[PDB]
Design a protein around this ligand. Structure first.
Ligand SMILES: *[C@@H]1O[C@H](CO)[C@@H](O[C@@H]2O[C@H](CO)[C@@H](O)[C@H](O)[C@H]2NC(C)=O)[C@H](O)[C@H]1NC(C)=O
Ligand SMILES: *[C@@H]1O[C@H](CO)[C@@H](O[C@@H]2O[C@H](CO)[C@@H](O)[C@H](O)[C@H]2NC(C)=O)[C@H](O)[C@H]1NC(C)=O
Ligand SMILES: *[C@@H]1O[C@H](CO)[C@@H](O[C@@H]2O[C@H](CO)[C@@H](O)[C@H](O)[C@H]2NC(C)=O)[C@H](O)[C@H]1NC(C)=O
Ligand SMILES: *[C@@H]1O[C@H](CO)[C@@H](O[C@@H]2O[C@H](CO)[C@@H](O)[C@H](O)[C@H]2NC(C)=O)[C@H](O)[C@H]1NC(C)=O
Ligand SMILES: *[C@@H]1O[C@H](CO)[C@@H](O)[C@H](O)[C@H]1NC(C)=O
Ligand SMILES: *[C@@H]1O[C@H](CO)[C@@H](O)[C@H](O)[C@H]1NC(C)=O
Ligand SMILES: *[C@@H]1O[C@H](CO)[C@@H](O)[C@H](O)[C@H]1NC(C)=O
Ligand SMILES: *[C@@H]1O[C@H](CO)[C@@H](O)[C@H](O)[C@H]1NC(C)=O
Lengths: 50, 198, 175, 137, 50, 39
């Protein structure tokens, strides 16, 4: 899966089978590292209007 | 439940934004609802065939949202004009327009702020306890006809008094409460009683 | 009535619920308008059986008991001057919350309160007052002394009756 | 009823105020037998003033009442991005989006106008005093 | 062949709903004016000219 | 605020609105309607 953002450390409880993470409005927070069991929060890069 | 008016605006704005955000997860006829997958799964000549379909769908969604926002903004402006008028007339002065600054006779108003709105506290005058009397348009005294300068003629059964129209406060009938106009063979319903001269 | 079309329609998201929501809001607004315009009286007043109003004649605007509906003469004239469900797609019309009889009752209560009490029924409780004195109170509002009315009462009564006759004829003739 | 047919509620010969409007003058309410009733709404309590050609009613006492009135003034300002929403982080998408001319700027213009009038509303409502007065201590 | 009909009928519905919304706003303004006139002209005496 | 949409802040903060509604209330109490016409 492709996507841009900043990956911070996470404090949330998954279940031994849950891999991905969704939000209120269909937003993705990919978590399960294919090499470990870290939890990651995907939040978009900052933007605005000059 | 008193503040439903201000809660409805917040609910409408939040729900419109939620619908606009949720509109992104729709195929609109394309293979996938995310264009990153489309660009990484097909050659450009058909990647663009999917892309422009997604473009048409999302552009239609934005235009619908903008039109609804315009209509709602027009309604809010129409309400804000009335709020400004009420602030100008009910607060900064005393209003004689009936049922404009509250039921009853308007006295004063006090403004209070609220989230995305304003609140007025109208103070009004209300009559409470009534009575029954017997009126007369005028009174003959010496063939003349005396009409009240301001007020009404009332009787408690035996005696006649003149009182203001909004509060019972009887007074003796005299030439300082009444004015004369011609004889009294024209008025209908006139009853004749003595008029005191100070 | 197409299972194949209704499945292609679901790929467009929620374009099908917004229209329904908007139309429902329009319907609610159309009920609220009629609610706020007519329903301004707490009680339902009615005129006394004997009509002694100082010479004024309100028989053209007071309700007519003889008609099946309690509408006035001028209301009966008005309802016949406006002309004009058959579609059978997903198109429907809903009945209004207040029937025409309820509107007629509201406009009868307002008028029967105005005649007897004046403007006192809009502030607190209705206070009776003879019509000839109410008209003097109204004349004093426009900077004219009440002895002008009290010495010309028959003339004003006749002019009002003639004006009502003229308005009835104009409504009955022109469409 | 005249607005359809209603199953689950019992007809009542009485008449009260309207709780849940149904249509054509029919209203429904939850009474107390612990059921749901469907009656015909009533406009108000019957009254008949004692009109007479030589009778008056004059109040002898008053009462002061305070009434609240709530009405909105301004809504929430917002602004949206054309490309970031339609073609978020995609060059191949933004290279096809501009083929539609100027459908973008004419949306931001409307949104900016809405946002400006949202502040004009508050300014015209509240800012009506030249100086900030103070109550005495 | 059905996608074209779906698009056309959806556009027709959108246009009808928008026109209905504008007309309803106009009728609401007229109803507010009528309510004000009933409150002031009928339930009292108005000093406002015309 | 995640898909190219943002909410701008209002020009008048909630303290300035309170200051306005306090100035109006303190003028009405101590001066009647005379503070709306002139001084
Ligand atoms: C109508 O009002 C007059 C004025 O107050 C009443 O006359 C007075 O009545 C009281 C007792 O009711 C006496 O003490 C006074 O001496 C009376 N004054 C005069 C000048 O006679 C009159 O009684 C009232 N009538 C009714 C039926 O209540
Ligand atoms: C006003 O007072 C006069 C008396 O000054 C009353 O006039 C009398 O009325 C009766 C009834 O018609 C006649 O029989 C008398 O001849 C009249 N007298 C005079 C001197 O004209 C008159 O009735 C009183 N007003 C009312 C309404 O009764
Ligand atoms: C008030 O006006 C009505 C007319 O609108 C009068 O009713 C008419 O009375 C005449 C009697 O001269 C009859 O010939 C008509 O047929 C009546 N018209 C209707 C529609 O009934 C009524 O009499 C007037 N009120 C008073 C007290 O004179
Ligand atoms: C006018 O009404 C007020 C209340 O609206 C009356 O004030 C009350 O008077 C009774 C005495 O009978 C007291 O027990 C109450 O405590 C009073 N209430 C208040 C709020 O002060 C007043 O008496 C009435 N005026 C007349 C002349 O009856
Ligand atoms: C292979 O993946 C496992 C998964 O946890 C990890 O423990 C291991 O270190 C990895 N080995 C290499 C050589 O990457
Ligand atoms: C005035 O008289 C009428 C009729 O007799 C009566 O219904 C009414 O209650 C009386 N007013 C008062 C204040 O008692
Ligand atoms: C007032 O009505 C009575 C009957 O209730 C009547 O006798 C009297 O003449 C009327 N008043 C006038 C001035 O006509
Ligand atoms: C209402 O009353 C009528 C007779 O006045 C009666 O026939 C009818 O059954 C009553 N309605 C109900 C629901 O009981």
């Amino acid at each position: 899966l492709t996507g841009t953002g900043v990956l911070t450390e996470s404090n949330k409880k998954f279940l031994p089978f849950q891999q991905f993470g969704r939000d209120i409005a269909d937003t993705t927070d990919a978590v399960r590292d294919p090499q470990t069991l870290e939890i990651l929060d995907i939040t978009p890069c900052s933007f605005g209007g000059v | 439940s008193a503040l439903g008016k201000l809660q409805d605006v917040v609910n409408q704005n939040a729900q419109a934004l939620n619908t606009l955000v949720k509109q992104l997860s729709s195929n609109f006829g394309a293979i996938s609802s995310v264009l990153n997958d489309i660009l990484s799964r097909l050659d450009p000549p058909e990647a663009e065939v999917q892309i422009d379909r997604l473009i048409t769908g999302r552009l239609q969604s934005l235009q619908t949202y903008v039109t609804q926002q315009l209509i709602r903004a027009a309604e809010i402006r129409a309400s804000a004009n009335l709020a400004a008028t009420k602030m100008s007339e009910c607060v900064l002065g005393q209003s004689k327009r009936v049922d404009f600054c509250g039921k009853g006779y308007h006295l004063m108003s006090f403004p209070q702020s609220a989230p995305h709105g304003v609140v007025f506290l109208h103070v009004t005058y209300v009559p409470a306890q009534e009575k029954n009397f017997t009126t007369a348009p005028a009174i003959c005294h010496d063939g003349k006809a005396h009409f009240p300068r301001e007020g009404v003629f009332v009787s408690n059964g035996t005696h006649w008094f003149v009182t203001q129209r909004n509060f019972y406060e009887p007074q003796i009938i005299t030439t300082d409460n009444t004015f004369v106009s011609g004889n009294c063979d024209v008025v209908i319903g006139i009853v004749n009683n003595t008029v005191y001269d100070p | 009535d197409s299972t194949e079309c209704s499945n292609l329609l679901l790929q467009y998201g929620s374009f099908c619920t917004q229209l329904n929501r908007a139309l429902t809001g329009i319907a609610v607004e159309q009920d609220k308008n009629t609610q706020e315009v007519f329903a301004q009286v707490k009680q339902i007043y009615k005129t006394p059986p004997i009509k002694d109003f100082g010479g004024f004649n309100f028989s053209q605007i007071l309700p007519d008991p003889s008609k099946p509906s309690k509408r006035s003469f001028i209301e009966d004239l008005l309802f016949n001057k406006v002309t004009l469900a058959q579609k059978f797609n997903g198109l429907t019309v809903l009945p209004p919350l207040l029937t025409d009889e309820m509107i007629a009752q509201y406009t009868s209560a307002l008028l029967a309160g105005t005649i007897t009490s004046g403007w006192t029924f809009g502030a607190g409780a209705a206070l009776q007052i003879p019509f000839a004195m109410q008209m003097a109170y109204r004349f004093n509002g426009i900077g004219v002394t009440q002895n002008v009315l009290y010495e010309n009462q028959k003339l004003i009564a006749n002019q009002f009756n003639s004006a009502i006759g003229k308005i009835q004829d104009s409504l009955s003739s022109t469409a | 009823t005249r607005a359809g047919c209603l199953i689950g509620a019992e007809h009542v010969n009485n008449s009260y105020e309207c709780d849940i409007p149904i249509g054509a003058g029919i209203c429904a309410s939850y009474q107390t037998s612990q059921s749901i009733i469907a009656y015909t709404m009533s406009l108000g309590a019957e009254n008949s003033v004692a009109y007479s050609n030589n009778s008056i009613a004059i109040p002898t006492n008053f009462t002061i009442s305070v009434t609240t009135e709530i009405l909105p003034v301004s809504m929430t300002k917002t602004s949206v991005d054309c490309t970031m929403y339609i073609c978020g982080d995609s060059t191949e998408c933004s290279n096809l989006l501009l083929q539609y001319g100027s459908f973008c700027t004419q949306l931001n213009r409307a949104l900016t106008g809405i946002a400006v009038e949202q502040d004009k509303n508050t300014q015209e409502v509240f800012a009506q005093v030249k100086q900030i007065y103070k109550t005495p201590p």
